């Protein structure tokens, strides 16, 4: 259901959901073969050597310039990523998260003429057709291979000359450098109430959790309510800094590092930002790039932001409607609640730096399933979290660094 059709890397482009594309801003990059696995979501099975110029080559942290270079790999990569989305989507939470994301079309704040609505083309990609013509397409999310540092997973946008799209409520297309071929090991934090009967050795993080973690960053950013990367907490451990955004995203006890005073400050801030958006739509009397109507566009953002529209068509931000949306996005969609749903083991806090990288392969149903992840049912790997025991389930994990 979430991805409706089998995509093989070697399938012929068609100009619709399989095509060579170009990421505006990459400039003169050569086209890359991407796949549209869902409305507003694409996957590029390449090592990210485009989003950032300074990182044009693939020359704890893992490096391998040869990684994800063969079509066969790109294939397995496409299937892994797809499998995880399905896994995330199979949970109500994930179903909800993925829904918010598709609805989070980055806002049309490209105009300098307050009475005009206009796209910000860094939120589009050029889809090359079979004839050779290109077509600009809007998209909310792109999943791409990692750059030089294979285990450096992040969420990145293209920013604006003046606007802060990820923090002004507008939003922007998000590019998640991620890989389903690796996972991290953490250590069974043994506490009085923790199950004593826990396998042995270190466990591996369920890759679905890792992806979820990023889609959460992607949600915040798409709705332009991401916490400034500068706001951090000096955790007592000298003193280590950790961004509020990360703590928020991880959720759980870590999210409580953001005191009530900060919470209200952020909530009132973006409430105000959303209001400006409603206000902008109201002043809007014309649109540019007409393959679509003004009304439709206004409605699309009414839906995204959950604005209220009076009989005269005037939009407005309803305080309790906002509260729900904003809460859902920042308090309900957290790594911790995903661990609750997946019922898998994961580090208890964002603070768990444990050197351990394993090459994995969740594509085979013999190793990983949508519903059980590594803790396969009938299998024996489904208890005390055996599936995630790099010892007990040694065959699914290959140490690297």
Structure description:
The protein is α+β, with helices and mostly antiparallel strands. It has one domain: Metalloproteases ("zincins"), catalytic domain like (Zincin-like, Alpha-Beta Complex). It is built from nine helices and 18 strands. The protein has helices spanning 71-89, 92-103, 207-222, 244-250, 252-255, 260-283, 294-305, 319-332, 335-342; strands at 18-22, 32-38, 41-47, 116-118, 124-128, 134-138, 141-145, 154-156, 174-177, 182-186, 203-204, 232-235, 240-243, 286-288, 308-309, 315-316, 357-359, 398-399. The strands form five sheets. Strands 6-5-1-2-3-7-9-8 form an eight-stranded mixed β-sheet, covered by helices on one side. A four-stranded antiparallel β-sheet has the order 11-10-17-18, with no helix packed on it. Strands 4-14 form a two-stranded parallel ribbon. Helix 3 packs antiparallel against helix 9. The longest helix has 24 residues, at 260-283. The two termini are 36 Å apart. The PDB classes it as hydrolase. The entry lists the keywords Botulinum neurotoxin, snap25. It forms a monomeric assembly. The entry is titled "Structure of the Light Chain of Botulinum Neurotoxin, Serotype A Bound to small Molecule Inhibitors".
In brief, what are we looking at here?
The protein has 401 residues and is α+β, with helices and mostly antiparallel strands. The chain is built from 9 helices and 18 strands.
Share in helix = 25-40%
Strand order of the largest sheet: 6-5-1-2-3-7-9-8
Structural class: alpha+beta
CATH C-level label: Alpha Beta
Distance, first to last CA = 36 Å
Largest sheet: 8 strands, mixed
Looking at CATH, which topology would you report?
Answer: Zincin-like
What's the alpha carbon Rg, rounded to whole Å?
22 Å
Active site: 214
Subcellular location: Secreted; Host cytoplasm, Host cytosol
Function: Has proteolytic activity. After translocation into the eukaryotic host cytosol, LC hydrolyzes the 197-Gln-|-Arg-198 bond in SNAP25, blocking neurotransmitter release.
Site (Transition state stabilizer): 350
């Amino acid at each position: 259901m979430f991805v409706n059709k089998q995509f093989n890397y070697k399938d012929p482009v068609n100009g619709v959901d399989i095509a060579y594309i170009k990421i505006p801003n990459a400039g003169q990059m050569q086209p890359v073969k991407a796949f549209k696995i869902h409305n507003k979501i694409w996957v590029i099975p390449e090592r990210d050597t485009f989003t950032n110029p300074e990182e044009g080559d693939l020359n704890v942290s893992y490096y391998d310039s040869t990684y994800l270079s063969t079509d066969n790999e790109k294939d397995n990569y496409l299937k892994g990523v797809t499998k995880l989305f399905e896994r995330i989507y199979s949970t109500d939470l994930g179903r909800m998260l993925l829904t918010s994301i598709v609805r989070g079309i980055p806002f049309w704040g490209g105009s300098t003429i307050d009475t005009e609505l206009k796209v910000i083309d860094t939120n589009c990609i050029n889809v090359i057709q079979p004839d050779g013509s290109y077509r600009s397409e809007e998209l909310n999310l792109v999943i791409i291979g990692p750059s030089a540092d294979i285990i450096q997973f992040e969420c990145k946008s293209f920013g604006h000359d003046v606007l802060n799209l990820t923090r002004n409520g507008y939003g922007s297309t998000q590019y998640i450098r991620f890989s389903p071929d690796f996972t991290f090991g953490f250590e069974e934090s043994l506490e009085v109430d923790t199950n004593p009967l826990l396998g042995a050795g270190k466990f591996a993080t369920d890759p679905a959790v890792t992806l979820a973690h990023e889609l959460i960053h992607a949600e915040h950013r798409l709705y332009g309510i991401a916490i400034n990367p500068n706001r951090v907490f000096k955790v007592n451990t000298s003193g280590l800094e950790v961004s509020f955004e990360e703590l928020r995203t991880f959720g759980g006890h870590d999210a409580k590092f953001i005191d009530s005073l900060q919470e209200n400050e952020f909530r009132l801030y973006y409430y105000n930002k959303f209001k400006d958006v409603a206000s902008t739509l109201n002043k809007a009397k014309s649109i540019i790039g007409t393959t679509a109507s003004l009304q439709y566009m206004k409605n699309v953002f009414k839906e995204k932001y959950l604005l209220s529209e009076d009989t005269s068509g005037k939009f407005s931000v309803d305080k309790l409607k906002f509260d729900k949306l904003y809460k859902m996005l920042t308090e309900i969609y957290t790594e911790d609640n995903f661990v609750n749903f997946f019922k898998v083991i994961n580090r208890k806090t964002y603070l768990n730096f444990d050197k351990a990288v394993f090459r994995i392969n969740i594509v085979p149903d013999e190793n990983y399933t949508i519903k059980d992840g590594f803790n396969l049912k009938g299998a024996n790997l489904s208890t005390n979290f055996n599936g995630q025991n790099t010892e007990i389930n040694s065959r699914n994990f290959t140490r690297l660094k």
